[PDB]
Design a protein around this ligand. Structure first.
Ligand SMILES: [Zn+2]
Ligand SMILES: [Zn+2]
Ligand SMILES: [Zn+2]
Ligand SMILES: [Zn+2]
Ligand SMILES: [Zn+2]
Ligand SMILES: [Zn+2]
Lengths: 207, 207
C-alpha cells in the first residue's frame, strides 16, 4: 500500500520530468525555427510546471505521516528533484524569452544544436534511469555535463569574440543567455543524478 | 511545542547558512591573498555542510509526522533552502579549487572583489531577513542579482578578451570558473528568496 503510494509518487515526478523534457524540446525547436509564437506559449505554460511541483511537494510532505530508512531518502529525493525540475523548466522559458529578443537581421548555430541535443538526451536518459535507482547510470549521465561545459566556454569565447574580429550585440547578448540557460539546465540534471547516488548510497556526494 | 520545534528547525538552517557565509568569506580571502593552504581546508570541510544539510533534511522529514498550511510551506521551505545552501557551499569549494590552479606568474581584480562583496552581503542580508518571513525584504535581495549578472558578463568579456588584445589562459580559465561560481552562489540566494515569497504568499513565483 505504502510501496504502491511511493511508486505512484515516483510516476507523478517522471510525469513532471517528461513535461520539462517536452518543453525543453519545444524551446529548442522554437529557437531553431525562430518561432516567436511557440516561444510565447512556452512562457505562458511555465506556471503549470510550478503547479505540478507544488502538487508533488505536497503529497510528499503528507506521505511522511500516513517512516523508514530507504523510503525516507526516497521521498526526500523526489522533493529535492522536482524543484530542480521546475528550475530546469524556468531556463527553458528563459530560452523562449531570448527568442523573442532575436532580430533577423543578423547574426549568430550547429554547435548550439549539439549542446542542445546533449542536454535533451541527458534528461531523457535520466528519466529512464531514475526508476531503476541505479547509482551508476546516474553517474554516467552526470559525467556528460563536462561536454556541455566545453560547449558553454567554446560558444562564449566565440560569441563575444564576434565583436573584436568584426563588430552585433543585441543578438550576441541573447545567445549568451541561451547557452547559459542550457548550461544551467544540464547542471540541474547532474544535481538530480547526485540525489540518485545518495538514494542508493545514503550519502550525498559531490560530482 | 511544535511551534518551538519549528523555530528550532529554523535556527539549525540559519546555523547552516552562517556556516556557508563564513566559508564564502574564507574562499574569497583565500583568493585575495592567494592562500593555497586555506583553500585546501575549505575543500576538506565541504562535507560538514553536506552533513549539516542531511541532519536538517532528516528532522524536517520526521517533523511532518510528530500538519497544517503555513507550517507545511515552512518545513518545505527549509528542506528546499538547505539544499540550495549546500550547493552555495560547493561553489565556494569550487573557488578554493581554482585558487590551487592559480600561477603567479601572471596575470588577472577589484571588480572581482566587488562581485564578491555583493555576493556576501546578499547572503548576510538573507540570513537576517529569513526569520522575519518578509516577502519584500526577500524580493529586494533577489533583485541585486541583476548586478552580479552584470559583473559576470563584464568580467567574462574582459577575461577572454585578454587573449586577442595580447595573448594567459591557465589563469584565465580559472578566473572564468571563479566568476561562474560566484554567479551561481548568488543565483541560489535568489532561489531562497523566492521560497520566502512562496512562504508568505502560498505560491512559488519566478523572479
Ligand atoms: Zn505503475
Ligand atoms: Zn555545467
Ligand atoms: Zn553538492
Ligand atoms: Zn530560539
Ligand atoms: Zn545570476
Ligand atoms: Zn522557478
Amino acid at each position: 500500500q505504502f510501496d504502491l503510494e511511493l511508486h505512484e509518487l515516483e510516476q507523478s515526478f517522471l510525469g513532471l520530468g517528461q513535461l520539462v523534457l517536452e518543453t525543453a524540446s519545444k524551446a529548442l525547436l522554437a529557437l531553431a525555427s525562430k518561432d516567436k509564437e511557440m516561444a510565447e506559449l512556452i512562457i505562458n505554460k511555465d506556471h503549470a510546471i510550478n503547479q505540478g511541483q507544488s502538487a508533488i511537494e505536497l503529497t510528499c510532505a503528507r506521505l511522511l505521516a500516513l517512516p523508514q530508512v530507504s523510503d525516507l531518502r526516497f521521498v526526500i529525493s523526489i522533493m529535492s528533484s522536482c524543484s530542480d525540475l521546475e528550475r530546469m523548466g524556468d531556463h527553458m522559458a528563459g530560452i523562449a524569452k531570448a527568442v523573442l529578443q532575436l532580430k533577423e537581421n543578423q547574426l549568430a548555430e550547429e554547435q548550439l544544436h549539439q549542446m542542445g541535443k546533449l542536454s535533451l538526451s541527458m534528461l531523457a536518459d535520466l528519466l529512464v534511469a531514475f526508476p531503476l535507482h541505479q547509482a551508476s547510470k546516474a553517474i554516467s549521465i552526470a559525467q556528460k555535463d563536462e561536454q556541455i561545459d566545453q560547449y558553454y566556454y567554446a560558444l562564449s569565447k566565440e560569441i563575444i569574440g564576434l565583436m573584436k574580429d568584426q563588430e552585433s550585440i543585441p543578438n550576441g547578448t541573447q545567445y549568451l543567455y541561451i547557452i547559459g540557460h542550457l548550461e544551467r539546465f544540464a547542471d540541474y540534471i547532474a544535481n538530480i543524478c547526485e540525489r540518485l547516488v545518495y538514494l542508493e548510497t545514503g550519502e550525498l556526494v559531490d560530482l
